[PDB]
Design a protein around this ligand. Structure first.
Ligand code: WSX
Ligand code: WSX
Lengths: 268, 273
């Protein structure tokens, strides 16, 4: 039994998730594709409305071909992440600078949390509806070990959307001014998540699940730093980042993120 | 043991083939790709193919066709494929001396009736029987699901294991068909076809064992007869489909029939340059 606010807090996040998560990627169009890292090698599949199936197999040892597509696809995911935060009441009340700082530090993490919901552990494929991404002693790349472990927990929709709230309202993000207001918000999401697990998962397989989930968020925070550095090493060599990704990567706060600033003011 | 004219007759067709047959399809670019109604779905089910497209880096794009507007996806591509092939078929005839000396209308009539047949003969050279795939260099076409006469023709012709000289002689016999619609020089073309047929019959005797290839010439002639029937069949199927869904290129519309040189001005223009 949750409090009348904890129940109201989850319904707001679940409604926020339903309104902003395009699980089928139906509105994901006008993206780049390979024209006619070694652990994260993926094979792109693209199904059509008529039932046709395009399949792209990347070449072997010679790798920057799929990055333009993965940049466009991740940008579309982050646009839904922005809209997810805009409809949360606790997020819109924050200053416009903290909304940019929180979305800068939680862009990658909230994308991963949504990808794990469409990840297939048995087939190794990220079933993104229209598109699919199938992989080619391999769960050492922290990106994939995180997804396989998180998928093993078999979390609910309420638990996934609560991890997004805890990751979004991180008080120790670079540039956050209201560090105490964000920390007060983050504590309530963790309390609601801890209370939800106790009321709906009495099984022994889900023992210490809240501490496991919090440990995943800490690991995902470390993987966020690793991948951001790995992608800046490639951007320095081969420019592949989208205009919105350059603002996140850091390539006066609202003046350096004019796209993020405009998206936070439009009607959600 | 061929005559010096039969020897020079083959040397001209081989030079004709090597100048106009892009066996690697290196110059086939800028083609379309996948982005009375009941009478169409028949042949489409028999000729369902999966397109493969390799890249310079080694990447492989593959298009699997949608299972049973459903099969109209490969039509724009195969129209560009057929058009590119036929333009090389036109260039093949434009360098043959016996073809240039014919009237400009008889040249159009021969190319109209032998367009499909000469295109199949070149497609059989790049067909892989054990894998069932037309290996067109960067492009590949593998079918799924020998009942279709066009498929039975390719499997039977590939089993004969003909030479490059025997393939180019089949193109000469099929090109110089005197009974094509609109041909005026029935006496000249029929005598030309006999000269190529005699050379093919004499080539098999002089360059192959006698008893094992005793009826190889008659088998080849039987293939051209069966291929002549498939040319009629396939032309009717695509006229039923083109009338419903336009997929034919302007050069294909002239062949399909959609004053002789004025109704085939594109084919005429390609014969003048
Ligand atoms: C399991 C993770 C999902 C994805 C498959 C569904 O896995 C990949 C697999 C293969 C590849 C390559 C090797 C083919 C390129 C890449 C990725 N994944 C990214 O490329 C990615 N993941 N997150 N972000 C991201 C987004 C962002 O907002 C726009 C800001 C910063 C971001 O990175 C700090 C990005 C760009
Ligand atoms: C058998 C080898 C060809 C090709 C390659 C594997 O197999 C096909 C496979 C599938 C398909 C569909 C049904 C899925 C589209 C078609 C075809 N092949 C044709 O559609 C074709 N073959 N020849 N011609 C042709 C050309 C011409 O010159 C311009 C004039 C008249 C012609 O037909 C009267 C055409 C149009």
């Amino acid at each position: 039994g949750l409090t009348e606010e904890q129940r109201m807090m989850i319904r707001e996040l679940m409604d926020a998730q339903m309104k902003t998560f395009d699980t089928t990627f139906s509105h994901f169009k006008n993206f780049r594709l390979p024209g006619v890292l070694c652990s994260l090698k993926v094979s792109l599949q693209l199904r059509g409305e008529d039932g046709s199936v395009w399949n792209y197999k990347p070449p072997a040892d010679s790798i920057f071909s799929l990055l333009p597509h993965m940049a466009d696809m991740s940008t579309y995911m982050f646009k839904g992440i922005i809209s997810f935060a805009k409809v949360i009441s606790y997020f819109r009340d924050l200053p416009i600078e903290d909304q940019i700082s929180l979305l800068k530090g939680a862009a990658f993490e909230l994308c991963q949390l949504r990808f794990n919901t469409v990840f297939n552990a048995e087939t190794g494929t990220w079933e993104c509806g229209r598109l699919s991404y199938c992989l080619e002693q391999l769960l050492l790349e922290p990106m994939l070990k995180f997804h396989y472990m998180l998928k093993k927990l078999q979390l609910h929709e309420e638990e996934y959307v609560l991890m997004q709230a805890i990751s979004l309202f991180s008080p120790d993000r670079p540039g956050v001014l209201q560090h105490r207001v964000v920390d007060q918000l983050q504590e309530q999401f963790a309390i609601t998540l801890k209370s939800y697990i106790e009321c709906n998962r009495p099984q022994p397989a889900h023992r210490f699940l809240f501490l496991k989930i919090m440990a995943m968020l800490t690991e995902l925070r470390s993987i966020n730093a690793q991948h951001t550095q790995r992608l800046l090493r490639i951007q320095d060599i081969h420019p592949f980042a989208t205009p919105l990704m350059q603002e996140l990567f850091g390539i006066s706060l609202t003046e350096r993120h004019k796209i993020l600033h405009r998206l936070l003011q439009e009607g959600s």
